[PDB]
Amino acid sequence: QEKMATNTVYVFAKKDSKYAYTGECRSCLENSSRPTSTIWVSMLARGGQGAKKSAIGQRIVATLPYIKQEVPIIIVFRALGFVSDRDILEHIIYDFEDPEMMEMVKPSLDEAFVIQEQNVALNFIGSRGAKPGVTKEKRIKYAKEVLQKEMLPHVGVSDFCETKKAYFLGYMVHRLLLAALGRRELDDRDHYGNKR
Amino acid sequence: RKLRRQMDIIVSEVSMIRDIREREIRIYTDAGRICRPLLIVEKQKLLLKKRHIDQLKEREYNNYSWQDLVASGVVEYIDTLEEETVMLAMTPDDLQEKEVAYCSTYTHCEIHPSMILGVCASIIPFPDHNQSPRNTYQSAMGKQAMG
Amino acid sequence: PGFVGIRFCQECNNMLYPKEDKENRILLYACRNCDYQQEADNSCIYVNKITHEVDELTQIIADVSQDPTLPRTEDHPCQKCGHKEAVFFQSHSARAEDAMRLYYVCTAPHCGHRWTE
Amino acid sequence: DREVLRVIFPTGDSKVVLPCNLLRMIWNAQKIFHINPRLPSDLHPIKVVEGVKELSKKLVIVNGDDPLSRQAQENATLLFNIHLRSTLCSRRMAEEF
Amino acid sequence: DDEEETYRLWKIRKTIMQLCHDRGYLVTQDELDQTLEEFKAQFGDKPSEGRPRRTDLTVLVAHNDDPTDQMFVFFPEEPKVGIKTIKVYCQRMQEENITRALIVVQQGMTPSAKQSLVDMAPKYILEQFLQQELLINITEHELVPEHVVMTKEEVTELLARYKLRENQLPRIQAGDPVARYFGIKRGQVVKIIRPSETAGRYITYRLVQ
Amino acid sequence: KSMESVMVKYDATVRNSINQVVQLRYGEDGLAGESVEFQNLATLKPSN
Amino acid sequence: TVINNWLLIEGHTIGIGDSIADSKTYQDIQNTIKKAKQDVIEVIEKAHNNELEPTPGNTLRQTFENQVNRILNDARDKTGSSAQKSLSEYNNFKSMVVSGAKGSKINISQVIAVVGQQNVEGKRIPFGFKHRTLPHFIKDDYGP
Amino acid sequence: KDILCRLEHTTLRKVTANTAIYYDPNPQSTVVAEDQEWVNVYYEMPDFDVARISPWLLRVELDRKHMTDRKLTMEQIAEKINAGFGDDLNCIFNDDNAEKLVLRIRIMNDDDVFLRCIESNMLTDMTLQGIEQISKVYMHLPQTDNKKKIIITEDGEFKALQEWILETDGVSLMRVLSEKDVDPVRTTSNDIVEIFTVLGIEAVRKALERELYHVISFDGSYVNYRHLALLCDTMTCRGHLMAITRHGVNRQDTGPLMKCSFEETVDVLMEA
Numbered sequence A: 001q002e003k004m005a006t007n008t009v010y011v012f013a014k015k016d017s018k019y020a021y022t023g024e025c026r027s028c029l030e031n032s033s034r035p036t037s038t039i040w041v042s043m044l045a046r047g048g049q050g051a052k053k054s055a056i057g058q059r060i061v062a063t064l065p066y067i068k069q070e071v072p073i074i075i076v077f078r079a080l081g082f083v084s085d086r087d088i089l090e091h092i093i094y095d096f097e098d099p100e101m102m103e104m105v106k107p108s109l110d111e112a113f114v115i116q117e118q119n120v121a122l123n124f125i126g127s128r129g130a131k132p133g134v135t136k137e138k139r140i141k142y143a144k145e146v147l148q149k150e151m152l153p154h155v156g157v158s159d160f161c162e163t164k165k166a167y168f169l170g171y172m173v174h175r176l177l178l179a180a181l182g183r184r185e186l187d188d189r190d191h192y193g194n195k196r
Numbered sequence B: 001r002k003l004r005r006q007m008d009i010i011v012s013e014v015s016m017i018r019d020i021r022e023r024e025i026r027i028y029t030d031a032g033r034i035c036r037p038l039l040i041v042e043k044q045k046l047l048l049k050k051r052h053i054d055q056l057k058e059r060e061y062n063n064y065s066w067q068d069l070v071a072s073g074v075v076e077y078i079d080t081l082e083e084e085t086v087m088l089a090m091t092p093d094d095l096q097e098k099e100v101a102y103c104s105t106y107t108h109c110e111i112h113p114s115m116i117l118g119v120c121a122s123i124i125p126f127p128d129h130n131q132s133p134r135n136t137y138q139s140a141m142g143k144q145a146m147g
Numbered sequence C: 001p002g003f004v005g006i007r008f009c010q011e012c013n014n015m016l017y018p019k020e021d022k023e024n025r026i027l028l029y030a031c032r033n034c035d036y037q038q039e040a041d042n043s044c045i046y047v048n049k050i051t052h053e054v055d056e057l058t059q060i061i062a063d064v065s066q067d068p069t070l071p072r073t074e075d076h077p078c079q080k081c082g083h084k085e086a087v088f089f090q091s092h093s094a095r096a097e098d099a100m101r102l103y104y105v106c107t108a109p110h111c112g113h114r115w116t117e
Numbered sequence D: 001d002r003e004v005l006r007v008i009f010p011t012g013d014s015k016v017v018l019p020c021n022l023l024r025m026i027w028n029a030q031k032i033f034h035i036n037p038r039l040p041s042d043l044h045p046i047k048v049v050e051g052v053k054e055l056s057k058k059l060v061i062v063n064g065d066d067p068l069s070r071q072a073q074e075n076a077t078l079l080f081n082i083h084l085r086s087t088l089c090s091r092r093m094a095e096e097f
Numbered sequence E: 001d002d003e004e005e006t007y008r009l010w011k012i013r014k015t016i017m018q019l020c021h022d023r024g025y026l027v028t029q030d031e032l033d034q035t036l037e038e039f040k041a042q043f044g045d046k047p048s049e050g051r052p053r054r055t056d057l058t059v060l061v062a063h064n065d066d067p068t069d070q071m072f073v074f075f076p077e078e079p080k081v082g083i084k085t086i087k088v089y090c091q092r093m094q095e096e097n098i099t100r101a102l103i104v105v106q107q108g109m110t111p112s113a114k115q116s117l118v119d120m121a122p123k124y125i126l127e128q129f130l131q132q133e134l135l136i137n138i139t140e141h142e143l144v145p146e147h148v149v150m151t152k153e154e155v156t157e158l159l160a161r162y163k164l165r166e167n168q169l170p171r172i173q174a175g176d177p178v179a180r181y182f183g184i185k186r187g188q189v190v191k192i193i194r195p196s197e198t199a200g201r202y203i204t205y206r207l208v209q
Numbered sequence F: 001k002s003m004e005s006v007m008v009k010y011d012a013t014v015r016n017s018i019n020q021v022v023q024l025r026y027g028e029d030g031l032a033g034e035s036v037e038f039q040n041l042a043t044l045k046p047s048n
Numbered sequence G: 001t002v003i004n005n006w007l008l009i010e011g012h013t014i015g016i017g018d019s020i021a022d023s024k025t026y027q028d029i030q031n032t033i034k035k036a037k038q039d040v041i042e043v044i045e046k047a048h049n050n051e052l053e054p055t056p057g058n059t060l061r062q063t064f065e066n067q068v069n070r071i072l073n074d075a076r077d078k079t080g081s082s083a084q085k086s087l088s089e090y091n092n093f094k095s096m097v098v099s100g101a102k103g104s105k106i107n108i109s110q111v112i113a114v115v116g117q118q119n120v121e122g123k124r125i126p127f128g129f130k131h132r133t134l135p136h137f138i139k140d141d142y143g144p
Numbered sequence H: 001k002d003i004l005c006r007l008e009h010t011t012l013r014k015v016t017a018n019t020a021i022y023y024d025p026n027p028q029s030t031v032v033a034e035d036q037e038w039v040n041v042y043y044e045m046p047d048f049d050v051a052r053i054s055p056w057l058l059r060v061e062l063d064r065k066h067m068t069d070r071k072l073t074m075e076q077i078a079e080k081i082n083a084g085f086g087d088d089l090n091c092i093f094n095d096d097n098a099e100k101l102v103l104r105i106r107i108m109n110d111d112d113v114f115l116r117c118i119e120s121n122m123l124t125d126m127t128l129q130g131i132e133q134i135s136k137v138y139m140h141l142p143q144t145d146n147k148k149k150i151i152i153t154e155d156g157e158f159k160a161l162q163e164w165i166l167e168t169d170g171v172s173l174m175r176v177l178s179e180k181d182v183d184p185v186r187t188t189s190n191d192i193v194e195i196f197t198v199l200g201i202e203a204v205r206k207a208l209e210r211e212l213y214h215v216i217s218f219d220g221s222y223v224n225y226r227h228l229a230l231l232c233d234t235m236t237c238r239g240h241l242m243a244i245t246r247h248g249v250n251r252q253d254t255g256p257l258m259k260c261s262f263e264e265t266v267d268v269l270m271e272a
């Protein structure tokens, strides 16, 4: 039986949906009883305005497993213990001498400047989950559980795997930015290097 | 690659892909990838020398198998990812002699083009002289002939 | 003109945002987490190249000369090192590939020069 | 009829579907009756005109006598009667048929 | 623009004249097709707050026979027409003794006024047309065949000859742009003459529903 | 299934199942499609 | 009945002798293929040096694609015509095509002269690999 | 070409080369190296204070190629922007002195990103030329006589005049038909619902007949006119377009057994 290759980042174009370019990674750790859990890193298209008098740029948003709402990328990066915008931009864009990519990621960075703490970021992660939280308590733990054992199991499931997961998520966002720029071509669903 | 042409540490099935345009190098060890053996072209010379054929004709005597040729660093398995970053020679009698040069930078050589076909498309005499729908229909009928 | 980069704070290392000075009529970069100010360098705070006239040679890297699947030529020597052999390839990018422009990369080691024909 | 046709067919083509293949029927009549068209004919052109008019009366799609049915009959066999006049006219029956 | 406005007003005037003539009214021959320069000379060549403004060219036409009924056409000043604007036209009509009238709206009518138009149908009939509807006489289009309104006597003759009822005729919408062009009400058979490539001419009938 | 009841009645008209006239005569001329041929109108395409 | 029973006396066949043209026709076919191939190559070298000018209405890549498809279609038609002038009136492919019973001129051209351009979704073979159709070709190879 | 430009939907994005926003509090000492500011220097248009007091501006540079192809001028674009934005915006253009076509836009008197928001709202839907709901339009000379203008000469002989015809990619009648130098008689369409909104039902019957004959006889096949006429008459014997689905067949009074014989079976019987 054919299947899409697991643990590999792909950039596709849902030309009919509200997303310009959508990234995905059907992450599945080898020798793990749990099945694969696909995480999507999408960019809201709305090429012009975001149907507002203030929403100028496109905002990158992530579809995490067991979470029903479109979580922003910066929220997840803050929830991983990276509070500074400079550090997140280091993990996303590896060169600070190409202002065009930084300008493209600027609207997504400026969506979530309200949330600055890891506690608030994790609380927003726990909001609108497949299993909704009770209060501030038992919802911080559920969000921590989701970020620990649901998204990206192939980069590791452990307490010290926060930075490795942050690096791989930054790679997913960076590849999405490259696809949005065209510096790397889009990925084919029928290329047999993308199948198992 | 030097370790894969010797089977020191890395298994022959494992594949390395160096993305050169974008600075990446990915090594795949998954279970499910689909590969096929290809000759290795060092210089515009094949590594399949005459001595390999001499030791390969006398099987059941020298115990020189296909796995020994894989261990000799002559053939290796190339999967679909690695085919995007390989210069594949079709046949050696045409694509290693000097001419008005096409690329002169071959890395692998196809063993024989007839091995691109399946089991039922291999029983067709002169399948390239036919039309492709006819080959497909014969492939359907070949699994139905009495015998 | 030119592109505009993201300014960064010095204390909390967040993004600085443009704002006006009601007194001196100058632009100041101000943080939103803390209260830190910087004098602006240019009036251009936002830019948008829509015709997309990009310098493709910047996106070209020298290591692509090691690709065996790229075609080589001994017809065009390198301008810097004078090496007669160089690889040539297309743009390999979107917002492009409407014109078939060749980009040459010299394959000589430790030079890595690229240019456009 | 020429003006009516040019109103009906703005595009300059006349390949139209009609029931009776009149040219073939004229040819069949020639072959059956052994015309030998070198000799002068012996049919009165007024017989041709009256026969065509009587035939157009005999070809009925719509029955009745009230003018609404008369207009329906005229419109039903307008194109065919135009073709019938064109093919079975006096000049062609006297010269080329 | 000002020349564009006078061209648009002249085209609307020409389409209204052709509509009245095809409806069966008294349309003067030179008024039926006048030059744009003639319109500019007669009205002023400046619709932008000038001589050829609206309400100056309200065309009053009578019927070819029974010259009593008239539908003196209306041209509102405002783009979006309302009830308090059409009540002035209702006052002008009740000042007269005629029940039909046409208004040429610039933008869309407010739906409350759309209901108000129906709210006086038995008393006096009001039709409305947008600017884009009257910038082209659709009856001149090659896709539109010859629509002719039939009298009641002809409808009775048709139904008696074909021995069928009004329920059995192929029908046509009351909101049909051609039906609106002729302003036919419900239950009014329209004969349609169109050329056919298999019979020459074909006359169909469309009862209004 | 849209037109499985549209037939020619005995007054040579075309009516559906509910006696609604689709065409007053079949094919706008009342002629069946088997006994017709392509013919040339000689009156059309001459010079005056 | 009667035509079949005359066909018994006459007999009708088809074979490998009906699919082979004389060496002069083969030389004409190969010369046409070589000329068209060189024409495509020189069009390619014009496109690389930005000496190709875009047709009004589309991009430069499509002016190139239109030129290449036009040249290859002209080669296919010319080779087909030059192939179907050498049947010698006894070729059974011509016997079936002229009668219209089975086949057409395109089948004769493809059997004898040249198969022609292969298409996927109305255009040429796409770059399934990274900027090449098959791993045997160099990258960015827009040749025939 | 003029009609082609007057029909195609031309936004500001398709014409602009690049754009940027600046902060130039003193227009006299403009930071963007332009002396054309002589206008503002001697302009009696409200100087600043409650006017050009807005120091931030929108500097957008057009290309000469698309301004030449669309047959546009700087004044026309400025007038369209002023009409679409009222007196809240100020636009200063550039004369034909250099290839650099400059439009400088200021706010006349949320804070600073509102100019960027209206920049997006100006690149999107300014509608400089043509109508909406239409993409690039292609024009050509016909070859088949169906589109060639067939005229009748004074000696009665037909003649095929090969005149330019347009062919759009969107659809909007009763608005293209309103344009000048456009034949309002022979201008047909490809969509049927749009004709039904414009030209009625019988014209839709003719249009459906022509389109059906086109899609049938494109590959050289022939289908008699009786069948085409019957299908186009059954779909238009109700006044409106009777789509051949459940949504159009099962909305006419034919019979519960007839309507349940189609795809929806139980629901029709339950409603009956």
Ligand SMILES: [Zn+2]
Pocket (backbone or CB within 6 Å): C009, C010, C011, C012, C013, C014, C031, C032, C033, C034, C035, C036
């Ligand atoms: Zn700060």
Ligand SMILES: [Zn+2]
Pocket (backbone or CB within 6 Å): C078, C079, C080, C081, C082, C083, C106, C108, C111, C112, C113
């Ligand atoms: Zn060099």
